[PDB]
Each structure stands twice: as C-alpha cells, then as structure tokens.
GROMACS .gro file of C-alpha atoms in nm:
model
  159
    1UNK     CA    1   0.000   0.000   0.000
    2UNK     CA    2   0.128   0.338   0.054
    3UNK     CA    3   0.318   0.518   0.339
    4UNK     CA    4   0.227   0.647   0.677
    5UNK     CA    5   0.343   0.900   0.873
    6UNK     CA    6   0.148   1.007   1.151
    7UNK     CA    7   0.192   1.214   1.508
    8UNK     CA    8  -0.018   1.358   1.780
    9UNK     CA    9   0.067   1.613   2.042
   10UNK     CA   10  -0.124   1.817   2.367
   11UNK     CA   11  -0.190   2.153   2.411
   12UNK     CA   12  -0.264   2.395   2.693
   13UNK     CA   13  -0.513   2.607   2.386
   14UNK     CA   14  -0.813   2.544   2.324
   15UNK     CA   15  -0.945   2.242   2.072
   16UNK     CA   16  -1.239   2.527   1.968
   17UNK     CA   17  -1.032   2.792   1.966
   18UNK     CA   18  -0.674   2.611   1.779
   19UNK     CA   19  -0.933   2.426   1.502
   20UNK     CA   20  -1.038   2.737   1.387
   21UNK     CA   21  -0.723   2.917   1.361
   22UNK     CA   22  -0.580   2.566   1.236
   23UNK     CA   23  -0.892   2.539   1.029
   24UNK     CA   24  -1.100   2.822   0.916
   25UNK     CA   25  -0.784   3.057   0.944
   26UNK     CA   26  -0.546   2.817   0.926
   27UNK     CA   27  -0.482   2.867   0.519
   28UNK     CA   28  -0.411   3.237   0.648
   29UNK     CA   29  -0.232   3.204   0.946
   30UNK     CA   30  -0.023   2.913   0.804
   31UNK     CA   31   0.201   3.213   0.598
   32UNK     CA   32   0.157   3.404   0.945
   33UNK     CA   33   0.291   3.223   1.217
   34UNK     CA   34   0.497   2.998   1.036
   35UNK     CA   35   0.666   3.175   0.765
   36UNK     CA   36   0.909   2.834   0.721
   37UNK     CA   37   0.634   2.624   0.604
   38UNK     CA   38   0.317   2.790   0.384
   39UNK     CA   39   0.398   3.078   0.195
   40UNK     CA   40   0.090   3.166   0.075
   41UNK     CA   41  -0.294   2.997  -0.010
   42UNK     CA   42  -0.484   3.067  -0.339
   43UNK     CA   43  -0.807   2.851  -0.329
   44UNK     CA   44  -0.905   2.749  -0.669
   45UNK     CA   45  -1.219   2.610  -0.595
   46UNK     CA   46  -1.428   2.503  -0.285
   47UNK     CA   47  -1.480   2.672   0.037
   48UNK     CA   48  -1.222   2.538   0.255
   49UNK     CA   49  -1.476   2.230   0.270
   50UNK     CA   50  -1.361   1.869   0.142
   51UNK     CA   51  -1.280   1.832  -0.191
   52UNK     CA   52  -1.188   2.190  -0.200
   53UNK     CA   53  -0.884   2.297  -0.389
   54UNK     CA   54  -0.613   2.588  -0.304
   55UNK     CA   55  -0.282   2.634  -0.473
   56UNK     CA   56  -0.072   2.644  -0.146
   57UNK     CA   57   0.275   2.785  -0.172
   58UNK     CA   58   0.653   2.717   0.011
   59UNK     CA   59   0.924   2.926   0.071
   60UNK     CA   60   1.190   2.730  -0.068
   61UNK     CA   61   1.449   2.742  -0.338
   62UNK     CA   62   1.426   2.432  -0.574
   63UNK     CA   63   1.228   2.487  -0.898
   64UNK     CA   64   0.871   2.319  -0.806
   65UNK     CA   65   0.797   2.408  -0.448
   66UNK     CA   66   0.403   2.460  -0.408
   67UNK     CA   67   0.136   2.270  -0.479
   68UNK     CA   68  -0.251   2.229  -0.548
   69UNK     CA   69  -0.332   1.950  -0.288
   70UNK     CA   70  -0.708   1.888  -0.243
   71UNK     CA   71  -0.901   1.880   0.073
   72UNK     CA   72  -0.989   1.569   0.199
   73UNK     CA   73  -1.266   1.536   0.499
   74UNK     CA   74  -1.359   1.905   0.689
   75UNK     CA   75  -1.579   1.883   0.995
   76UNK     CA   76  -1.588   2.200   1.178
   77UNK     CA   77  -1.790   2.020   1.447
   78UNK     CA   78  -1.580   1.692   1.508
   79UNK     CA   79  -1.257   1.899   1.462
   80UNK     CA   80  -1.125   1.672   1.211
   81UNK     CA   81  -0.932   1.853   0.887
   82UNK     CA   82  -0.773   1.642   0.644
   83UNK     CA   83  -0.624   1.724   0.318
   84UNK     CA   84  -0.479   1.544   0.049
   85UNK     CA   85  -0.189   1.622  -0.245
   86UNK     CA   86  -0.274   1.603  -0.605
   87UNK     CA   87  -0.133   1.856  -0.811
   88UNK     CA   88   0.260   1.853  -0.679
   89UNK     CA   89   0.564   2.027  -0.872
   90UNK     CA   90   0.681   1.660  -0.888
   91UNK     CA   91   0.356   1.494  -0.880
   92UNK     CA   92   0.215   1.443  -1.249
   93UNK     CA   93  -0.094   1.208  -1.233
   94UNK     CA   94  -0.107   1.006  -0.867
   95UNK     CA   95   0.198   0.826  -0.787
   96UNK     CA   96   0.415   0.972  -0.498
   97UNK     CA   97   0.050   1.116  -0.334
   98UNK     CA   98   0.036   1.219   0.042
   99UNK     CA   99  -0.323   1.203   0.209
  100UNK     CA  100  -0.270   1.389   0.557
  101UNK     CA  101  -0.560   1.444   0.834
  102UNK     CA  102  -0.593   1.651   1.140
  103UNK     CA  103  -0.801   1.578   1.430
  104UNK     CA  104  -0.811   1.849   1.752
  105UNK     CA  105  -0.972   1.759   2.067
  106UNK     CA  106  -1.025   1.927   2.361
  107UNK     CA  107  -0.952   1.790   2.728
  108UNK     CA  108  -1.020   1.862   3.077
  109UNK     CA  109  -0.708   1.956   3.153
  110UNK     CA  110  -0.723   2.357   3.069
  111UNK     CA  111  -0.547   2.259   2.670
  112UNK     CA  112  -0.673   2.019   2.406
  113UNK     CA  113  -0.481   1.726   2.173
  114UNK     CA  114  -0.440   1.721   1.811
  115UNK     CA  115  -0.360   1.415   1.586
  116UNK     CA  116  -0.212   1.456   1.278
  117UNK     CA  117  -0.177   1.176   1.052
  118UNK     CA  118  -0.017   1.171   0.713
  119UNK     CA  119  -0.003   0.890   0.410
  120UNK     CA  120   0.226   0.866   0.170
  121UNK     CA  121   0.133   0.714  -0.183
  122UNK     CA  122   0.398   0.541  -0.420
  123UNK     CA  123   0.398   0.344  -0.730
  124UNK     CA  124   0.673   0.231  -1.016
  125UNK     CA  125   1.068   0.177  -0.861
  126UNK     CA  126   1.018   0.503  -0.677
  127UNK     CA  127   1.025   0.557  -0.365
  128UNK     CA  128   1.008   0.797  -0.014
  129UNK     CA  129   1.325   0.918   0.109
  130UNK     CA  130   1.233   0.983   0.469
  131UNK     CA  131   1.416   1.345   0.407
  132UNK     CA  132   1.126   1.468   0.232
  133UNK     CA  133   0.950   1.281   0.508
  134UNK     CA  134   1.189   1.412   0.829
  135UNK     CA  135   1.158   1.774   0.679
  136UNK     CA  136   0.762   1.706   0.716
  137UNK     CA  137   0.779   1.631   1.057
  138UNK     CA  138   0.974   1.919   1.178
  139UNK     CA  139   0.757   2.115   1.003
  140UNK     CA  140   0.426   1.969   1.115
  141UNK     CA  141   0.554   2.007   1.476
  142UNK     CA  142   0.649   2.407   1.381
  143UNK     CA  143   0.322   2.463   1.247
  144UNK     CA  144   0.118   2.342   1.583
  145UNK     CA  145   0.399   2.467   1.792
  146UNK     CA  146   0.334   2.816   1.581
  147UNK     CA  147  -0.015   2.893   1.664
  148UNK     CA  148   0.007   2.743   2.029
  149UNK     CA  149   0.268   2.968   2.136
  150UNK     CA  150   0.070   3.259   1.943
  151UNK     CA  151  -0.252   3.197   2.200
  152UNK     CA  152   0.013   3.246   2.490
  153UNK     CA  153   0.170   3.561   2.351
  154UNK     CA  154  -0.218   3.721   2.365
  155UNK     CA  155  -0.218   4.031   2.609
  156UNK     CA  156  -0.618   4.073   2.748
  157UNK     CA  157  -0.511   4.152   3.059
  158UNK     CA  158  -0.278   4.327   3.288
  159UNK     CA  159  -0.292   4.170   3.631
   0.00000   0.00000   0.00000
C-alpha cells in the first residue's frame, strides 16, 4: 500500500479555539505564524470544505515548491481537517500522493490534543526518502507549535 506518517501532540489552547485558527484561518495564518512552512494559499475552488482545492505555496528554493493538494474530509464540528496532495511540482498524475488528516480535541485539563496523521502514496521503482518525510515532521511540529505559542503571547489583561 502506501506510506504512513502520523503524530499527535497536547496543548494547553483550546481544541475550539486552535481548530479554527488551524482550520478556518489556518490557510491564512499558516504564511503568518509559520513563515518556514506555507507561503501563501490561493483557493481554486471550494470553500475550505472537502474536496476543495487551493494552490498552497513554500518558501523554498528548488524549482517546483508549491502545490494544489485537495481537501480531503472538513468537519468543523468533530474537529477533524484532512487534506490530500494532487497537483505537486513533482507529482504528475497520482503516484508519490500524500493524504494527511488533522483531528483536535479538547480535554479537561485547561489545553486540548491534536492528531495529525499523514499517508504517503507510491507506485513504479520510486520511492520515499524519509528526508522529504523528516523535513515534514519538523515542520508539522512548527506549524502546531506556531499557533500554540501565538494563544500564549495574547495580552487581554494586565494583572
């Protein structure tokens, strides 16, 4: 079949709160708070809903960098965002695909958990060089690590 490649990690935030900057503003705060990873979103079609379709872009240097990628399963009640790749500087038809999925949850511990988990399609004598796949990770974690220390840097109040 094809690869996998997924994490989880807690948060002191919010599930509510982190799903909808991860999820209705996440395509906008992704080029915000993590200017390593995303650097900009251009949704071709679709609302942000699954199935929807946004040429995301990253700051890098090679010649193909961003990417269409499609969304997979939204639920803005279940907290569950997943998205998958499809039209990839290297990608032509479907080989080499990556289906990814995020999950937040809230717990009664003042903070919530999120589980990201990530696929990783291949076909013909290719392959996945876990580079590409170590560079994911450390981004992943930079992206949820982005927006969580955001929340804490709020300032409502003085004493």
């Amino acid at each position: 079949g094809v690869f996998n490649y997924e994490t989880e990690t807690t948060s002191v935030i919010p599930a509510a709160r982190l799903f909808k900057a991860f999820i209705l503003d996440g395509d906008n705060l992704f080029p915000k708070v993590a200017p390593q990873a995303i650097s900009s979103v251009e949704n071709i079609e679709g609302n942000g809903g699954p199935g929807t379709i946004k040429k995301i872009s990253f700051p890098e240097g090679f010649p193909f960098k961003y990417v269409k990628d499609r969304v997979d399963e939204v639920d803005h009640t279940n907290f569950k965002y997943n998205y998958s790749v499809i039209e990839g500087g290297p990608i032509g038809d479907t080989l080499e695909k990556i289906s990814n999925e995020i999950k937040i949850v809230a717990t009664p511990d003042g903070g919530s958990i999120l589980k990201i988990s990530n696929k990783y399609h291949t076909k013909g004598d290719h392959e996945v060089k876990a580079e590409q796949v170590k560079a994911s990770k450390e981004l992943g974690e930079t992206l949820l690590r982005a927006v969580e220390s955001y929340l804490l840097a709020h300032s409502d109040a003085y004493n």
